[PDB]
Amino acid sequence: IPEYVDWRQKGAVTPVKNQGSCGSCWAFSAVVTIEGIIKIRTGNLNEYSEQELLDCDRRSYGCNGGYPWSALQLVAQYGIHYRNTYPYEGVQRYCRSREKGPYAAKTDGVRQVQPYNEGALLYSIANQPVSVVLEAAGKDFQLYRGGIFVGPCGNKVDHAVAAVGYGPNYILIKNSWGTGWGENGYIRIKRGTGNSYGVCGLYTSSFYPVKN
Numbered sequence: 001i002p003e004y005v006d007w008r009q010k011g012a013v014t015p016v017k018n019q020g021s022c023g024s025c026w027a028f029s030a031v032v033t034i035e036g037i038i039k040i041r042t043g044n045l046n047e048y049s050e051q052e053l054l055d056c057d058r059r060s061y062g063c064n065g066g067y068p069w070s071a072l073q074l075v076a077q078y079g080i081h082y083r084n085t086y087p088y089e090g091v092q093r094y095c096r097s098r099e100k101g102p103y104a105a106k107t108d109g110v111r112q113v114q115p116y117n118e119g120a121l122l123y124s125i126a127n128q129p130v131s132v133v134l135e136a137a138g139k140d141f142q143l144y145r146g147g148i149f150v151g152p153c154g155n156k157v158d159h160a161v162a163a164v165g166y167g168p169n170y171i172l173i174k175n176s177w178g179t180g181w182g183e184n185g186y187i188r189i190k191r192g193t194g195n196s197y198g199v200c201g202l203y204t205s206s207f208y209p210v211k212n
């Protein structure tokens with residue numbers, strides 16, 4: 001795999017979103033990987049509905065949090081609507097997939113990256129955007145304004161984001177806190193520290209959709 005991967009340069013990343021007050025990071029995370037893999041497989045970049053995952057993933061808890069892997073299973077089992085048809089409301093409502101006609105996209109499945117393994121994560125990111133989790137509760141993460149982030153942070157992972165690239169000394173992360181946070185909405189997190197958790201627990205739990 002190359003020394004640098006940046007899926008934004010391959011036109012595989014949609015603009016940065018702001019999840020707002022709702023704890024829907026897991027659905028934003030999931031959607032980034034769906035948007036990425038649909039572009040990689042079909043050549044079209046589209047935006048898909050975080051709101052639909054929020055309303056329709058019964059394993060998750062709406063704005064109270066959820067599971068990227070569960071949302072990814074939803075999309076493989078059923079599909080997902082365009083974001084324009086099922087726009088983000090920042091509040092869990094009832095699942096409106098049937099009202100909004102046929103799904104715009106469907107995946108074939110969900111894989112887990114083998115946890116606590118930096119090379120396994122980078123291999124996956126070389127192929128497509130990957131849903132990853134990290135500890136975002138710490139003030140240093142929240143006030144991040146740019147640079148390679150090394151922490152301080154612990155391993156109490158609480159926030160699902162999407163890795164859309166990496167370099168020699170960082171993993172490139174699309175966050176869902178708007179374009180004002182971090183590096184236009186992105187964070188570069190240090191890798192290769194020999195901490196198998198990853199910094200801020202980045203290697204704890206990573207998933208990507210499969211599409212054939």
Ligand SMILES: *[C@@H](C(=O)O)[C@H](O)C(=O)N[C@@H](CC(C)C)C(=O)NCCCCNC(N)=[NH2+]
Pocket residue numbers: 019022023024025026061064065066067068133134157158159160
């Ligand atoms: C993340 C966010 O929106 O910033 C959001 O709180 C979230 O989805 N958190 C996850 C943990 C990460 C995905 C590692 C989470 O807390 N998942 C468990 C479900 C939420 C707690 N359960 C209930 N019933 N409230």
